[PDB]
Amino acid sequence: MKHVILGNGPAGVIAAETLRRAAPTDDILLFGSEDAPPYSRMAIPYLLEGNIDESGTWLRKSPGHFDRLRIHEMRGRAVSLDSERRRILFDDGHFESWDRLLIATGSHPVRPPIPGIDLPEVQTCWTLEDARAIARFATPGARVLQLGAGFIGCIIMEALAARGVELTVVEMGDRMVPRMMTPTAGGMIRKWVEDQGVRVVTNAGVSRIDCRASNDAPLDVTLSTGEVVVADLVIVAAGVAPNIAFLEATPVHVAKGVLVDDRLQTSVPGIFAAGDVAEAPDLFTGAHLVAAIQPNAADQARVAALNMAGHEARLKGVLAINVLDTLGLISSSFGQWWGEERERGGAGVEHVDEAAYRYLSLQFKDDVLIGATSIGLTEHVGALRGLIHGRVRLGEWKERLLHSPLQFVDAYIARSQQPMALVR
Amino acid sequence: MGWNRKVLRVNLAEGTCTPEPLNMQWADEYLGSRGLATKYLVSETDPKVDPLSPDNKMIMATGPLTGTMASTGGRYTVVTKGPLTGAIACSNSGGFFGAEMKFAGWDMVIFEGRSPTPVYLFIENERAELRDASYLWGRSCWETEESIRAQHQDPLIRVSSIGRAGENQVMFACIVNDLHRAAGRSGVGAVMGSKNLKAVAIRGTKGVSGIRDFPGFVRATSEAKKVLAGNPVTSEGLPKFGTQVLMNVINEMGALPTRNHRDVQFEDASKISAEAMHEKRPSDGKPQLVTNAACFGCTIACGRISAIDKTHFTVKNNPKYWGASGGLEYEAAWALGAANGVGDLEALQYANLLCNEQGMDPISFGATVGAAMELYETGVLTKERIGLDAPFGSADALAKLAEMTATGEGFGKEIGLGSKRLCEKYGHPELSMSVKGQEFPAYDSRGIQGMGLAYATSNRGACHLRGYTVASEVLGVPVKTDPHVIEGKAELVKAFQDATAVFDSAGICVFTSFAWTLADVQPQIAAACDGDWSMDKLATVGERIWNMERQFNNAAGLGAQDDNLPPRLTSEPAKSGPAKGMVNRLAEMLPEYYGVRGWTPEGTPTPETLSRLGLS
Amino acid sequence: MGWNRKVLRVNLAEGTCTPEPLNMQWADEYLGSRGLATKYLVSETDPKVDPLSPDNKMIMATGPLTGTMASTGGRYTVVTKGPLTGAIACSNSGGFFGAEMKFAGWDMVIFEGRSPTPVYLFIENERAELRDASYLWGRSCWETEESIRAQHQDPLIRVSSIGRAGENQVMFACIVNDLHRAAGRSGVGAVMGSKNLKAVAIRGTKGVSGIRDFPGFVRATSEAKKVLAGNPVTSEGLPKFGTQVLMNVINEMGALPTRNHRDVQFEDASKISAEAMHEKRPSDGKPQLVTNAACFGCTIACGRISAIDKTHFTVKNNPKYWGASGGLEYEAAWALGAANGVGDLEALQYANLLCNEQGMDPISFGATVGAAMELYETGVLTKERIGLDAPFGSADALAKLAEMTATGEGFGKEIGLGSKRLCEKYGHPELSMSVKGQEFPAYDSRGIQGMGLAYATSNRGACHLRGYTVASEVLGVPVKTDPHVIEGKAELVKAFQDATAVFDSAGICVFTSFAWTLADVQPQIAAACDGDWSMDKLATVGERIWNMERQFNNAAGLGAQDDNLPPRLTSEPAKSGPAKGMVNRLAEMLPEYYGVRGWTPEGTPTPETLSRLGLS
Amino acid sequence: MWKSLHIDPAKCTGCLQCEMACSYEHTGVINPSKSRIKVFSFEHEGRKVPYTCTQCTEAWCLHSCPVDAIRLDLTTGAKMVFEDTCVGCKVCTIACPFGTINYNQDTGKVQKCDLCEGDPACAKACPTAAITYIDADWTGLARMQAWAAKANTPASAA
Amino acid sequence: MWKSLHIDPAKCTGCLQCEMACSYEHTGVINPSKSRIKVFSFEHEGRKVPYTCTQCTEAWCLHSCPVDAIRLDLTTGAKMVFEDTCVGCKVCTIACPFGTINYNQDTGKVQKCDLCEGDPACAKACPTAAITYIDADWTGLARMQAWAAKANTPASAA
Ligand SMILES: Cc1cc2nc3c(=O)[nH]c(=O)nc-3n(C[C@H](O)[C@H](O)[C@H](O)COP(=O)(O)OP(=O)(O)OC[C@H]3O[C@@H](n4cnc5c(N)ncnc54)[C@H](O)[C@@H]3O)c2cc1C
Ligand code: SF4
Ligand code: SF4
Ligand SMILES: [Mg+2]
Ligand SMILES: [Mg+2]
């Protein structure tokens, strides 16, 4: 047969490796657009700090790795798809044919429509060229202004603060990390960050950025409240949207993300999708949602490649898991951390210690754990995923978990790994 | 070297916990954990202050082998001046607390003064702080440990605390760590509770470095473990039967007191022995014993785990005692059992649960209960005063008295005074079975003479763990001798006391002496510490420790008049058994002991032995 | 194809066990497991070598149908130059060891040289290595098996070892695997122990792949098993009674030797037969037989399981022999029984247990003991020399002699020399009942004429398995003949020897020849191996194997002057039974056998017959 | 319509004809070390007993899988392993209290007795009839009839 | 030829003798809080259970790493962390459903059990033999043997 894969991130690499392992008598083509070997963008911040070189961001470092597995590497950007007679038209004028297709094109950042946002000193942080420009401009002692206080915004502000410059954060919302933390933990993170020496102004937006007499001096940014800030470099971390630029006039159904079923497959027989572009069913209810994280990309790529080769594999669902390091503080969140309506039988617990920077919260919908959120907990923090993903029927232990929420590993052992080791 | 070179020295009157270096040239003369702590006490306090007051002092200490790879290396000590006796008190406990103290960077803690408000102490590797504990006062040990662990958000914190029997200042309170492991004797809990100190909590993440020779130490420990694995006593007897195996063995010989030293044999001793803990109960068809557990680093695992019946009349209306906790040791089973005449097994476990929950001492409590029951049977105590009938062999009376004494309500307020003071209050001092204020352990001294001599000449009142001559006359592990003879006993007592002092100072369990010897203990200390640790130095250390303890004890006021026994043990012949018609002969062995020890006829060290041991 | 194409070739002098491809063009001419091993031996050694020396060699081999789905396909062989006879020795063993060697990946192991220090071999699928065994020298087979299995932490390892008689170089030692089911006869244990090798341990998880036709082989085995399941002998007789059922039958014909071939009928033969095993003992009311067992893949299950009495004087004070082990075969019961006039079943069971434990041969031991009894009864041997009275019918003497021979102390040393050398030492060679150094099996040659010739002209000594003509003169499964004539006997012997050689070379149990035939064995070999495997090829292979063995034996120094019998069999008439006044008439059959085989009258192959088989 | 294996250890000879068939039916090569039924020999009492999975209804192996690669069958009432969803985490071998469902390091999955989709191969190759395939209910008929005949002593010689 | 650790939690006494060895080998100081095998104690029933890594075949940790710092060792079949390409991004610590790979802040890296390259030191220091180093296949033979002896009653006393 013949398999053609678009995009060479984690998803494409894992899918190609699994396809080569499964069916050793096929042709595999892997495509990309950037002028670099397959690399993770996740390790861009540590390039900014100076811990590693650029070559340390590569996904596979063993020399000549994509030859022993007989995988063909090409270059080109897909611009047109013809699903009726299975044709792909690239930008360079050449053409390719296929038998099975996998779409793993990822996402791209979005810019707010602010006047003067295309000035040379306004950069995003998504690729290697942006990292090079930021490194060129962020000399020690410079002036930096950043937009957004989300997740990637927190990572970038941590990296830039470690680089050793002044920092200012403008957030349009009400608190920091509003999508992965409760307000109390957000307040703790805010006060810790302000103590460490980073100025944060909240509940405000950017009105306009204006240029001075020459492109050697910094810029003048006027906020919504009225005050003006002089800043050499401006970082934009608004948000990201999926890469869908050739599926608009095809019978492939496309919402905000590409829609798939439990075994990854779009609404055409012979086209598959995985990564940041796929919209997959939820674990709790069953709706479609997009989660842009690394374990999701790995698992979806493996399942899609296994189903595409001819076998039959199934996916359980998707889940949002996050871990964050900010200037020496480690925090994490799992699942439906915001709880649920009490009239349907839920319960929760929250333990807080302010002067020592400690927090923990547990939520139970009906005899099963549903979400968790913690600050400073690092040992055996993976067992929460085991308790949430596989819905363990806690039973009596539920009451115990309401009085001391630090015995989740003990409950997991006594309920779903060795239930008969305690029988006497 | 096994020492970590740091002391804490907190000042309970105003806080101010400030570190301080350890004193070398004292470490290589007493070896630590029984001689270093008592030297620190003796060299800076006075022997005349009353037991409970602000002017007193308390020391917590560990040993050089504590928290290392050596077998049974997890023991720690508490040193103070006992309020029950008036002598110097040193209590030893196991568990996982001394190891955690050693992993945190310290190896000694000194408490002095008195705090105006209740507080508790917290240590994290450099950061020791005092915190308000006004919400823990009046709660038992288990709730205190659970509340501290839940508040500080860490399930690996090691906690030591007192109960309600320390706050009320019962004369025989104790310190309990890790639920069922505990110190005891001489009422150290009263001294802890007189300072408004509630609990100590330790968390340690630094490790034990500083060994002069690592591979030699590892090889020595590995070679020494084989000898312990080979002996039948420490390979099949202890792990399978606990210390309860001695019940029938002592009962057959006719050396088991019963009903306040009125008999020398118990008819129901087969009902509370070790075999009764392995039989399937008729109601549920399951034994009381579940498994066994071990202290830190121990490779013998002599502990007990027991489950109480759910249909017994004492706990059938209470659902908070239905779990699994610690079992019965030999002394507790004797004191709650044959000392009163109670043949039930569930009542003993219930009383042990109460004693572990509220922090008391089973031996002193059982002996005092037996004395009170004898007084009631004679006629001095009436029903109206007690509020309850107390005949011999009544389990309900034992349970009721245990509840009243632990909760400190009613006649228990008298019961908590102790057998000596309670007997003196009612004009009958001859009915107290004690020497210098502490009641006798589970061995009778009519059929055995070395135990009588060991009781009469011990440095902290009547204790059987200072000089243990049963191991030569019953088990006979070095040699088998005759327990009916009074020839060659003083040298036995002297050698055993010296060996026990060295073992206690080393920082390891004493039970390993059933298979080890000083030959098997010297190489590990030599490879672990700095200096010349030969055999002569070890013998000199033992003698020096004993002589310095005797000097401190003698300076405080106690003299040769206190080396006596109650008239019942020296004028009442035995009634039945192999030792029928025998009486103790302490008068024929004490002058020989004074002669062979090198002291005066009145029990005072001479300048010759003081100059020989370098005590001047 | 059934072969795996790999040989080991270990060098005991310096280690260095290095693999090597199998030699095809010899496998399709000898079929393996009785021709391939001896072809290797003949082609790479010299026949003039002494039996035990470093220059000797030892070969362990399996067959093409070893470890497959075919019935009874689990047998292996050991080939060497025997020390008891001087001719070529081939021993066949069952159990579970040959199948495990087949599953490991190999199908032949060659030992050459002598090791300076005691070692043993360990094999896992690609990894063969020699390991020290100095802590195993001087232990029994059971103990070394359990020790290896416990030390390696694996209950799926197969072990083959020797006893104390192998280390002492007793001339009739053997090799035991799986606690019974051993080799024997020509004394291969002495050769194994002279090479300073203790045991072989093997564990295989690779599987028998490579059969040229899977569905054809499956169908062939399914059809072949149906014939075996309908025959009365191999469906009800052998599984229920075993090989012992013959005893009474032979006794009814008056062809059972008794008391060193002095009689032809035993009066107590009904007390050691199978029915005597099926009866209840008055002491306990339970029979001596428990259940039967089967070798690897066998669907007949003619094995035995027996338990010894607990009140017999031999085993009354030894609780080590109170378990359940293998039962009595026919030849062990004859040699320990009727050969000495002993009618006690428990003594026979104890002797067989000792022989299995220490690794000896029951037939040679029993014959040597009988010769010693006759020598004592004559008057040559005095009570002072032996150390005990040795009359006929003494069970106690048999037990003591068994213990002495097993441990090799005192007169047992002399008993370790075999019957022929022992008789020659005292100047009575006429009392040794042996041909070429091997004693006689349990079939008399006076009431049977075919077995006299069969004993006279066998390639390894007095053996009854090379040519078995009792199957026609007693049971008569091919054709019922008359055992009182000598007409048409040479053709019988020739055909039976060729068929037996083919059966042994194939790799299946020979008992299956009671229902199977060559026509039922051809399809399985044809569907398993590759090439042309027809009836003519099988006949040619059998004849070639026999001729090559005879040629090697001739080149070793043995000729036509050793084909004789003791004077007692050919000169003394029978004394009871239906064969009255009959003696063997071997002198009237030997020239016919030489002529029919196509040999020179002096017993050498002619160039015509040598060229016909391609042996030149 | 459900059926189960009946094992009778009083009629076993230890010929290991079960394991060759069970391994050949699943792998393609004769290999008694990769079967899912095992024969244990107790020498001191002279006994041989074969053992395999009993197909529990409160399955411990079913409830401990984090990916749901084990599920029930309704035709034969057999627990199955779907060997392209399993990831070889080896947790299912710890939860089972009986010792079955084991690992296979050559392919990288686990294995247990799956009743061969209602056509057992081990029950066809046993010559002594010590393994039988009978209906799930009423497995004690054969012993009950014999004990009913034997235990009730006749009114004879009395 | 691969092997694995077998844990039997009915024989453990909670002496913590194995954490000392596992920490001394890898750090050089005695420290039972930096070990890679843990022991959990259940007081209401009185049981103790050790806990370590199972060495998955399709392990989540190997696939989740963004910089390729975890690799498989062919000789012993273990996943090993190369602490020179790791950057301490901690994404591998939330993507393990059992939570055995953990984070060390003294050096700023991660740590997990690596089988000590075919020479475990935790199995040599355990006196009660509650940790063993056996072959990966057939880790349930002991339980099978015990239950075969227990369930299959003999034809005696009846
Ligand atoms: C804890 C955590 C921290 C993170 N930190 C960061 C961070 O600091 N910065 C950050 O940017 N992300 C960060 N992420 C996000 C994460 O690194 C990626 O968003 C995602 O995991 C990559 O998955 P993917 O392969 O589907 O996307 P991608 O790796 O983006 O895959 C898209 C690939 O396809 C190529 N492509 C694009 N268009 C085409 C086309 N038309 N034809 C062919 N190929 C095409 C692209 O060049 C790219 O190589 C973080 C995630 C987590 C969980
Ligand atoms: S017939 Fe007897 S000796 Fe031959 S294989 Fe079968 S059980 Fe073994
Ligand atoms: S090994 Fe496979 S079947 Fe067993 S629990 Fe893990 S994923 Fe499930
Ligand atoms: Mg104590
Ligand atoms: Mg044989």
Author numbering:
A (entry chain E): 1 to 424
B (entry chain B), C (entry chain A): 1 to 616
D (entry chain C), E (entry chain F): 1 to 158
Lines from the paper:
Aldehyde oxidoreductases (AORs) are tungsten enzymes catalyzing the oxidation of many different aldehydes to the corresponding carboxylic acids. In contrast to other known AORs, the enzyme from the denitrifying betaproteobacterium Aromatoleum aromaticum (AORAa) consists of three different subunits (AorABC) and uses nicotinamide adenine dinucleotide (NAD) as an electron acceptor. In addition to the catalytic W-containing subunit AorB and the FeS cluster containing protein AorA, the protein contains an additional flavin adenine dinucleotide (FAD)–containing subunit (AorC) that enables the enzyme to reduce nicotinamide adenine dinucleotide (NAD+) alternatively to viologen dyes. The enzyme is involved in the anaerobic degradation of phenylalanine, benzyl amine, and benzyl alcohol, not only mainly detoxifying surplus aldehyde intermediates but also taking over large-scale oxidation of these aldehydes in the absence of dedicated dehydrogenases.
Here, we show the molecular structure of AORAa, the first bacterial multisubunit AOR, with a global resolution of 3.22 Å. Unexpectedly, our structure reveals that an extended protein filament is formed by AorAB protomers that is nucleated by a single FAD-containing AorC subunit. Our reconstruction allowed the model building of an Aor(AB)2C subcomplex with good geometry and refinement statistics, while the third AorAB protomer of the complex showed too low resolution for full structural assessment. The repeating units are connected through a polyferredoxin chain generated by lined-up ferredoxin-like AorA subunits, essentially forming an electron-conducting “nanowire” decorated with enzymatically active W-cofactor (W-co) containing AorB subunits, reminiscent of another recently characterized polymer-forming redox enzyme, the hydrogen-dependent CO2 reductase (HDCR). It binds four iron-sulfur clusters through conserved [CxxCxxCxxxC] motifs, which we numbered FS1 to FS4. FS1 and FS2 mediate the electronic connectivity to the AorB subunits (11.9 Å from FS1 to the FeS cluster FS0 in AorB), and FS4 of the proximal AorA subunits connects to the FAD cofactor in AorC (9.5 Å from FS4). The largest interface in the complex (1662 Å2) is formed between AorC and the proximal AorA, which takes up to 16% of the surface of the latter. The conserved Arg41 bonds with the 2′-phosphate by a salt bond, while Glu294 interacts via an H-bond with one of the ribitol hydroxyl groups of FAD. A β-sandwich domain (residues 1 to 211) forms a base that is linked to the W-bis-MPT (W-co) cofactor by a magnesium ion bridging the MPT phosphates, as well as two α domains (residues 212 to 418 and 419 to 616), both surrounding one of the pterin moieties of the two MPT residues.
